[PDB]
Nucleic acid binder design. Structure first.
Lengths: 73, 785, 36
RNA sequence: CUCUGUCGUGCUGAGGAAUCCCUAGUAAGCGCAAGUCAUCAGCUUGCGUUGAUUACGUCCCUGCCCUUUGUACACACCGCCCGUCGCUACUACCGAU
RNA sequence: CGCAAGGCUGAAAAAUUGACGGAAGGGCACCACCAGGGGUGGAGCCUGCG
């Protein structure tokens, strides 16, 4: 469910400006569910997913190499 | 080793199970048989009784547009369809888990909705004999069904559910009672309104009218309240006039009229009945100006009341072919032609050969009955302490004697010579009545539960409350011996024809066999799951089997035992209540058994898997592209006609099907399966990878199997030709998908960095002092070495 | 012999040597070596 | 066992269905020695000698064991297995005492 | 030496933790597949087992 969470998180960030999400004050922010730890968890898991997709793109240039070989033939 | 079989069964009009139907016939439910009476003359028309089934019947429904076909719902969960022309079951439906409780028919009668106590409602087709579908809502049991197509139901979780039928999911729900239970449902015949009867005596009233928006169909137009605050059993509407009848399980039926909702509905009349009514039903007779309300009581009777529309009169009643409360004793004649049955409130004596009642008396309570020889007079010992005497041939009461003061005569036995009777009571004494004049009494330690004589009138045997048996001599009442070893008090006893055996039935769920010389227990044999009420020997050893005996218990069973070889020879089922009394014939060829049932009875490859799924998807793609060309030419009717596996899996796309068959396999098996896949199967896989990357889903899985395909076939791809076209398509689609996903996650991580820095700037510090020592996650990470 | 086997199995007492932990000396509590 | 000569298939015939065992100094042949408080001379156990064919893969068949709870943390991967009942708690129902 | 050493008697449960399965996936096996080899089983002798 990482792609659907990343896409609706992208929609959330593109909808609301940074000052609102930084000055977000909700009464249920205590301990492990406060805003710092929530944004830290989201950020670090997004870092892992981004590293995976970067390795996938770099490995995905193989198809351009194969099409270049078939263009040579 | 002759066994026993059910041959006769009688003494019953409508049971305490629900749902009476009228047709001028009344169709009611006896225990396992559905029987139809005339109300005018008391002779029943017919009985519907099936040899394959034993379970009790508890829901009846008449099909509309075709009477002489009926739907009955039993206790095991089965439904049968009967005919009134011929008494057979044409179709049987075994769909539910337990206890069908509410039936309903369509207006056209082709469709049948049955709701159970196992909370499933299942709708049934009647031309294909297939369970159509299974509607699934309802926290607990469904108490009301109706066909509005549409279905309207209500359950014991106090919810009315309005279901659709074209799309088998619920359209509406509403909650009828806030903290109670909706107990009954009544629909107007024109579908304008529905009233639901709840636990407090409150009747809620709803109006009906005749998906992406707010659908609103049922509207709580108001609440009503009846007079009695009981759990309301039914609400029945008049099919023709403007009335309905509301009743709970009580002695009143409240008929209200249709003209705030309290102004719309006013009580027309309140009908008192003599017994607690279980199910009311409506009847309209051709040529009368009245309301024939047909009530069927729990106390074993039908009553037809006439209600005048714009008072009640007890017009018709059926009470002669049944005892009205509960049979406590049976005693059958010396000529074995007639028997007597003694119930609370009544004596009714019957003929065996015709199974039809002949005489009726009224007594207060009837513990023990036995007739005197010559079968002219009968003896009844009652709960109030007395002994009444009646006679058959003139049908009258001769004598009454206060045997004990207020202590119930628990045992009555006639002498085998026939000149004396013995009554053992709930007092300590047991009295002897010679004919009647009191001859000798016997004072003993506790209350005498059961006493019996010997067939050669030599020794007597009382059976106390002290869990013991005292066997005395008959001439002088000296203690011959006493039998012990019963954990709970003895309920009954029967001793053998030659007086060499006693069986002794206790409340500790076993029977004992004593030898009656020295009184040694032959074998204590635990044979019933509940406290064994009664035992009886067959008296004649003319047939070579005089040491056999029957035992009837609270677990709805009779058992035929052999005392010589100490072995149960038969188990007699067929009773649906705690069997109170039984008796055997003097010839011994049949026996009668009278229950709590109120029915007395008479007994005589992974790679190959993904490859075939690839081929299925490929044929689906070709059919869909041909259908696209057809619908582009003209909007005419063109069916794609895909695979039954796809239209059974639910019209999923071929992409979704082949994605699931690639997702199901574990990753090592995925590596081996894609290795085993041949190059004839590769191009279809490459088209489906193009489809995945186009409609992006599982991009890491798509790229994984794509790079495995290219690396394990790199020379063959660069030598072939059509792979250029489809690989160019998959390159464009995969690069677009990867760039889109990567740019979205990059925007996310950049925004999270920005908002984290802003939150740090909010968090930093307010005060400034000399101590900046005020301005980190830590994990534990144990390790053994 | 058969009744002896049935008695031991029912009121089950078996004389097999049981698998003991190899670090019962230094780690007597048997803590788990991960997140704590 | 190796080498050299003399004669040449001549009651002078290598075990059916089944069933079992066996993967390297193993199968199989051969002799020599001992006789160890139980067993063993109708044999037992050692000891040397000669020494192959064919598998050394796979869970397809027949099975056996185990995962679906735990027992460690990074990379990396997976992603709520399914049924018939019991027991417990609560809720209302049924009908006798 | 004292107690043990007096017969409602007469042979053949536990459970919020339990009872039984199924499907998928692994591991192993000359009591499995595969490739071969060798016994026994045919005649006679005899220990032993029934």
């Amino acid at each position: 469910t990482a792609p659907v969470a990343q896409r609706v998180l992208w929609a959330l960030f593109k909808s609301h400006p940074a000052n609102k999400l930084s000055s977000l004050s909700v009464k249920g922010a205590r301990g492990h569910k406060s805003l710092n730890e929530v944004l830290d968890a989201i950020k670090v898991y997004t870092e892992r997913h981004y590293k995976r997709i970067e390795e996938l793109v770099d490995e995905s240039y193989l198809v351009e190499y194969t099409l270049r070989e078939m263009d040579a033939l | 080793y002759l066994k026993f079989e059910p041959s006769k069964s009688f003494g019953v009009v409508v049971s305490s199970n629900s749902n009476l139907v009228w047709s001028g016939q009344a169709i009611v439910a006896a225990n396992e048989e559905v029987l139809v009476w005339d109300i005018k003359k008391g002779e029943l028309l017919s009985r519907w009784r099936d040899e394959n089934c034993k379970f009790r019947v508890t829901a009846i429904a008449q099909s509309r547009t075709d009477p002489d076909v009926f739907a009955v719902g039993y206790e095991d969960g089965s439904i049968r369809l009967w005919d009134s022309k011929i008494a057979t079951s044409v179709v049987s439906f075994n769909g539910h888990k337990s206890a069908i409780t509410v039936l309903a028919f369509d207006k056209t009668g082709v469709r049948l909705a049955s709701g159970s106590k196992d909370t499933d409602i299942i709708v049934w087709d009647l031309v294909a004999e297939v369970g159509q579908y299974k509607l699934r809502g309802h926290k607990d049991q469904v108490t009301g069904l109706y066909f509005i197509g549409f279905l309207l139901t209500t359950g014991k979780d106090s919810l009315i559910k309005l279901w659709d039928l074209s799309s088998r999911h619920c359209i509406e729900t509403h909650v009828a009672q806030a903290n109670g239970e909706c107990w009954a449902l009544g629909v107007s015949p024109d579908f304008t309104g529905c009233i639901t009867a709840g636990n407090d005596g409150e009747i809620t009233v709803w109006a009906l009218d005749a998906l992406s928006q707010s659908v609103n169909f049922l509207q709580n137009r108001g609440t009503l309240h009846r007079s009695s605050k009981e759990r309301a059993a039914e609400v029945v509407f008049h099919p023709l006039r403007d009335y309905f009848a509301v009743h709970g399980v009580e002695k009143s039926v409240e008929i209200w009229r249709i003209r705030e909702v309290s102004d719309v509905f006013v009580q027309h009349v309140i009908v008192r009945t003599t017994g607690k009514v279980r199910s009311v039903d409506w009847a309209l007779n051709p040529g009368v100006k009245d309301l024939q309300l047909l009530v069927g009581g729990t106390n074993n009777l039908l009553e037809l009341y006439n209600i005048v529309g714009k008072d009640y009169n007890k017009a018709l009643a059926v009470e002669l072919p049944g005892h009205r409360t509960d049979i406590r004793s049976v005693a059958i004649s010396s000529d074995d032609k007639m028997l007597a049955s003694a119930a609370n409130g009544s004596l009714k004596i019957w003929n065996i050969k015709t199974q039809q009642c002949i005489r009726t008396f009224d007594c207060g309570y009837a513990l023990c009955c036995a007739f005197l020889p010559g079968d002219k007079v009968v003896i009844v010992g009652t709960k109030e302490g007395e002994l009444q005497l009646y006679d058959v041939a003139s049908a009258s009461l001769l004598e009454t004697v206060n045997a004990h003061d207020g202590h119930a005569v628990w045992a009555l036995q006639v002498h085998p010579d026939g000149r004396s009777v013995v009554s053992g009571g709930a007092d300590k004494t047991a009295k002897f009545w010679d004919f009647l004049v009191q001859s000798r009494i016997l004072k003993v330690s506790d209350d005498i539960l059961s006493l019996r004589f010997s067939p050669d009138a030599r020794l007597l045997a009382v059976a106390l409350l002290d869990s013991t048996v005292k066997v005395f001599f008959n001439d002088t009442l000296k203690l011959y011996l006493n039998l012990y070893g019963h954990k709970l008090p003895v309920l009954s006893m029967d001793i053998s024809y030659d007086s060499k055996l006693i069986v002794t039935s206790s409340a500790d769920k076993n029977i004992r066999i004593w030898g009656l010389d020295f009184g040694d227990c032959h074998k204590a044999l635990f044979g019933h799951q509940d406290s064994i009420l009664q035992v009886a020997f067959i008296p004649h050893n003319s047939d070579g089997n005089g040491h056999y005996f029957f035992s009837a218990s609270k677990d709805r069973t009779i058992k035929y035992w052999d005392a010589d070889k100490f072995e149960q020879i038969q188990r007699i089922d067929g009773h649906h209540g705690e069997i109170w009394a039984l008796a055997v014939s003097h010839s011994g060829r049949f026996l009668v058994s009278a229950s709590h049932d109120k029915s007395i009875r008479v007994w005589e490859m992974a790679g190959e898997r993904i490859a075939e799924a690839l081929e299925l998807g490929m044929t689906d793609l070709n059919t869909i592209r041909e259908w696209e060309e057809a619908r582009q030419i003209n909007p005419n009717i063109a069916p794609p006609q895909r695979n039954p596996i796809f239209v059974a899996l639910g019209n999923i796309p071929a992409e979704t099907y082949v994605l699931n068959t690639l997702q199901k396999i574990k990753p090592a098996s995925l590596h081996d399966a894609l290795l085993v896949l041949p190059f004839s199967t590769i191009p279809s896989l490459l088209t489906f990878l193009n489809l995945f990357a186009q409609r992006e889903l599982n991009v890491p899985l798509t790229c994984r199997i794509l790079f495995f395909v290219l690396k394990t076939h790199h020379k063959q791809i660069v030598a072939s030709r059509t792979m250029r076209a489809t690989l160019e398509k998959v390159r464009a689609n995969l690069r677009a998908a990867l760039r889109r996903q990567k740019d979205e996650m990059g925007f996310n991580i950049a925004a999270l960095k920005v908002v984290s820095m802003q939150l740090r700037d909010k968090s930093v510090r307010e005060y400034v002092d000399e101590t900046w020592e005020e301005k980190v996650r830590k994990r534990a990470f144990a390790s053994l070495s | 012999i058969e009744e002896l086997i049935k008695r031991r199995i029912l009121a089950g007492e078996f004389d097999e040597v049981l698998r003991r932990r190899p670090d019962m000396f230094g780690n007597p509590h048997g803590v788990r070596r991960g997140l704590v």
